[PDB]
Amino acid sequence: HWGYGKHNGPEHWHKDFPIAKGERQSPVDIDTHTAKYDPSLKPLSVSYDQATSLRILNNGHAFNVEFDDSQDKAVLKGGPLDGTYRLIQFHFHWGSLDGQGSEHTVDKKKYAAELHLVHWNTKYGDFGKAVQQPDGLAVLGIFLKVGSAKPGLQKVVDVLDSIKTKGKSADFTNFDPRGLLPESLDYWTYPGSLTTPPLLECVTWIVLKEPISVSSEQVLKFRKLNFNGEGEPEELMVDNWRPAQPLKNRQIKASFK
Numbered sequence: 400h401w402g403y404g405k406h407n408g409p410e411h412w413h414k415d416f417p418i419a420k421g422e423r424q425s426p427v428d429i430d431t432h433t434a435k436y437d438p439s440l441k442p443l444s445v446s447y448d449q450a451t452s453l454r455i456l457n458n459g460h461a462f463n464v465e466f467d468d469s470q471d472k473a474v475l476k477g478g479p480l481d482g483t484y485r486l487i488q489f490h491f492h493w494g495s496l497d498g499q500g501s502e503h504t505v506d507k508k509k510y511a512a513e514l515h516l517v518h519w520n521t522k523y524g525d526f527g528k529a530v531q532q533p534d535g536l537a538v539l540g541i542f543l544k545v546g547s548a549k550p551g552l553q554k555v556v557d558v559l560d561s562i563k564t565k566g567k568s569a570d571f572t573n574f575d576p577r578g579l580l581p582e583s584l585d586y587w588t589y590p591g592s593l594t595t596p597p598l599l600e601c602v603t604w605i606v607l608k609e610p611i612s613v614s615s616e617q618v619l620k621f622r623k624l625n626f627n628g629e630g631e632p633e634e635l636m637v638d639n640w641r642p643a644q645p646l647k648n649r650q651i652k653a654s655f656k
C-alpha cells in the first residue's frame with residue numbers, strides 16, 4: 400500500500416492521494432525569521448488531568464497510544480483554536496539516525512523525532528466527521544532531540560516489545576501525557592494537513608518551540624519496531640516521516656516575540 404519505502408514512499412503518494420499536491424499540505428519548514436508574531440494569539444490551554452489512555456497499537460506506519468474520546472476528558476483549547484478539541488491519540492515519527500526523523504523542520508533543522516498529539520473538534524461529533532472539515536483537527540507537534548532521558552516517555556518505550564509488528568496491540572491504561580510536554584507552551588501555528596494518507600486538509604497545526612530531550616536508548620527502542628506483520632520479512636520501522644512540503648499561500652504565526 401503506501402509506506403515509506405523506495406517504491407511506495409512520499410514521492411509516490413500523490414498517485415493514490417492526489418491531495419498530496421494540494422494547497423495546504425504538511426509538514427512544512429518553519430522559517431523562524433519569517434514567522435509573524437501575532438499578539439492576538441491566546442495561550443494554549445492543555446487540559447490533560449482527566450485523560451484516559453486505553454491501548455497502544457502498531458498500525459504498520461507508527462504506534463498510536465489511544466485515548467477514551469467519548470467525553471471531554473483530555474482537551475486542547477485556546478491558542479488559535481475556536482472551541483474544544485478532544486485528544487484521541489498520540490504517535491511519533493522518527494529516523495534511522497539522530498540527525499533526521501522529524502516532519503516539521505525549524506530553519507531546515509531536522510530533529511530526531513516528532514510527537515503528534517491528535518485532537519478533534521467536538522462540534523463535529525466524531526473523528527471521522529472531523530477529518531472532513533477544514534477546522535476538524537488540532538495536532539500539537541513536539542520535537543524530540545537526543546540528550547537526557549525523558550522520564551515520562553519510559554512507560555511507552557517499555558511496552559514496545561509487546562507490539563513489535565503490524566497489527567499488534569496492548570492494553571495501555573493510566574498513562575499521563577502531561578509527562579511528554581516541555582516547560583514552555585510557546586508555539587507556531589499554520590493551517591495544514593494529515594502527514595500520512597489520506598493527507599486530508601483538516602489540521603490546525605500547533606508546533607511547540609521548545610523540544611523535549613529523550614535519551615539515545617529511548618529512541619533506539621523506537622527503531623526496533625517493525626513495519627511488517629509477524630511472520631513477514633522484517634523491515635525496521637525507521638524513517639517514517641514525510642519531508643517538508645511547499646508552504647504555498649500560507650503564513651506561519653508565532654505566539655511569541
Ligand SMILES: NS(=O)(=O)c1cccc(NC(=O)NCCCCO)c1
Nearest residue numbers: 400401402406407411412413414415
Ligand atoms: N504511495 S501509493 O500511491 O499509495 C502506492 C505506490 C505504489 C504501490 C502501492 N501499493 C502496492 O503496491 N500494493 C501491493 C502490495 C505488494 C506487497 O507485497 C501504493
Ligand SMILES: NS(=O)(=O)c1cccc(NC(=O)NCCCCO)c1
Nearest residue numbers: 458515517538592593594595596597
Ligand atoms: N501524522 S498526523 O498528521 O498527526 C495524523 C493524525 C491523524 C491521522 C493521520 N493519518 C491516519 O491516521 N491515516 C490512516 C493510516 C492507515 C490506518 O492506520 C495522521
Ligand SMILES: [Zn+2]
Nearest residue numbers: 490492515594
Ligand atoms: Zn503524525
